[PDB]
Design a protein around this ligand. Structure first.
Ligand SMILES: Nc1nc2c(ncn2[C@@H]2O[C@H](COP(=O)(O)OP(=O)(O)NP(=O)(O)Nc3ccc(C(=O)c4ccccc4)cc3N)[C@@H](O)[C@H]2O)c(=O)[nH]1
Ligand SMILES: [Mg+2]
Length: 160
């Protein structure tokens, strides 16, 4: 069947794993690659998801998995300004290794269940506009937007 190689990236503790585990195992972790057969819009397919480490000391350690990934979830946390500002470094590295200005990618603002938010939705929305990619807010805690984020990414790959 069609396989989709998805890579989840972002700063430490933004919820890369919590999003992946919600999708795959249907539970929130209050404290890796995954393969799952799904059906998305009638298409039977396999999600092969890489849930990346939050720290690397590499950037050549990242080049390996960015090379093979077809689409990327770029995750920040809406209560973490640093994680939002780091999005630019991750996107530029992905473009550098894939030799492309256009790579399937979704900008994800996670932890949208929190009331102490430091990054405004309009802020992230306008950034996503300038990249020409979709912005989706998620909560791994409530499962809001989780399938949305991953399915939208799969649709971006199908359109590339
Ligand atoms: N209220 C919310 N909390 C969330 C959410 N997602 C993660 N978490 C919590 O944030 C913490 C970090 O989550 P997680 O380990 O999934 O994040 P990361 O994978 O990005 N961490 P890391 O691999 O970079 N490691 C260091 C952990 O305590 C989660 O329960 C969410 O949507 N809302
Ligand atoms: Mg993790």
């Amino acid at each position: 069947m069609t396989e989709y190689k998805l890579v989840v990236v972002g700063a430490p503790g933004v919820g890369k794993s919590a999003l992946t585990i919600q999708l795959i195992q249907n539970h929130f972790v209050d404290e890796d690659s995954y393969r799952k057969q799904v059906v998305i819009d009638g298409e039977t397919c396999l999600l092969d998801i890489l849930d990346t480490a939050g720290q690397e000391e590499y950037s050549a350690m990242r080049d390996q998995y960015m090379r093979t990934g077809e689409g990327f979830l770029c995750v920040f946390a809406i209560n973490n300004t640093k994680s939002f500002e780091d999005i630019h470094q991750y996107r530029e590295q992905i473009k550098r290794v894939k030799d492309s200005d256009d790579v399937p990618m979704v900008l994800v603002g996670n932890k949208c269940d929190l009331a102490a938010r430091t990054v405004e939705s309009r802020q992230a929305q306008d950034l996503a506009r300038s990249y020409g990619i979709p912005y989706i807010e998620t909560s791994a805690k409530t499962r809001q937007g989780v399938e949305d984020a991953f399915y939208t990414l799969v649709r971006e790959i199908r359109q590339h």
